[PDB]
Swiss-Prot record:
Autophosphorylated at two clusters, the T2609 cluster and the S2056 cluster. Autophosphorylation induces a conformational change that leads to remodeling of the DNA-PK complex, requisite for efficient end processing and DNA repair. S-nitrosylated by GAPDH. It is linked to Immunodeficiency 26 with or without neurologic abnormalities: A form of severe combined immunodeficiency characterized by reduced or absent T and B cells, recurrent candidiasis, and lower respiratory tract infections. Some patients show dysmorphic features, severe growth failure, microcephaly, seizures, and impaired neurological functions. It comes from the Eukaryota. This is DNA-dependent protein kinase catalytic subunit. DNA-PK is a heterotrimer of PRKDC and the Ku dimer (composed of XRCC6/Ku70 and XRCC5/Ku86). Formation of this complex may be promoted by interaction with ILF3. Component of the core long-range non-homologous end joining (NHEJ) complex (also named DNA-PK complex) composed of PRKDC, LIG4, XRCC4, XRCC6/Ku70, XRCC5/Ku86 and NHEJ1/XLF. Additional component of the NHEJ complex includes PAXX. Following autophosphorylation, PRKDC dissociates from DNA. Interacts with DNA-PKcs-interacting protein (KIP) with the region upstream the kinase domain. Serine/threonine-protein kinase that acts as a molecular sensor for DNA damage. Involved in DNA non-homologous end joining (NHEJ) required for double-strand break (DSB) repair and V(D)J recombination. Must be bound to DNA to express its catalytic properties. Promotes processing of hairpin DNA structures in V(D)J recombination by activation of the hairpin endonuclease artemis (DCLRE1C). Recruited by XRCC5 and XRCC6 to DNA ends and is required to (1) protect and align broken ends of DNA, thereby preventing their degradation, (2) and sequester the DSB for repair by NHEJ. It is found in: Nucleus; Nucleus, Nucleolus; Cytoplasm, Cytosol. Belongs to the PI3/PI4-kinase family. The modification N6-acetyllysine is found at K73.
Length: 121
DNA sequence: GCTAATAAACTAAAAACTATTATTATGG
């Protein structure tokens, strides 16, 4: 977290999208962090959420939304609890920018992808 | 020169169905 904060402390100074190496590193680390994102501390968790929001805002020159790690996250097991809501937060981060609501990069079903949410209702 | 009892509607709570209430743990 400290090093990524330092990295994003400047974005106009440097922004990695030239080599595909930096792009895939950014996407892979994005996946890493959004797999790691959870806290019972309710603020450092939101801190990570805002970190991701800032990251995607200052980027997408090298970023790619999985729509799968998120999908399994916000879907949960169709529970009664509030767990999968964390993935829902990702959606806001996803809706933090002009991102496609669900790009079917392969397409899970492109239809029940939102049926999961209307079930979460 | 006869109280052997039973057919007792009463004032019975000894469910609360579903509707606001409130401490908690709070949050930044």
């Amino acid at each position: 977290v400290e090093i990524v904060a330092t990295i994003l402390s400047w974005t106009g100074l440097a922004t990695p999208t030239g080599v595909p190496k930096d792009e895939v590193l950014a996407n892979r680390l994005l996946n890493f962090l959004m797999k790691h994102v959870f806290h019972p501390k309710r603020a450092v968790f939101r801190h990570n959420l805002e970190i991701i929001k800032t990251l995607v805002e200052c980027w997408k020159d090298c970023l790619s939304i999985p729509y799968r790690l998120i999908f399994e996250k916000f879907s949960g097991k169709d529970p009664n609890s509030k767990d999968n809501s964390v993935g829902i937060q990702l959606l806001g981060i996803v809706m933090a920018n002009d991102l496609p609501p669900y790009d079917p990069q392969c397409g899970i079903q492109s239809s029940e992808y939102f049926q999961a949410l209307v079930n979460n209702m």
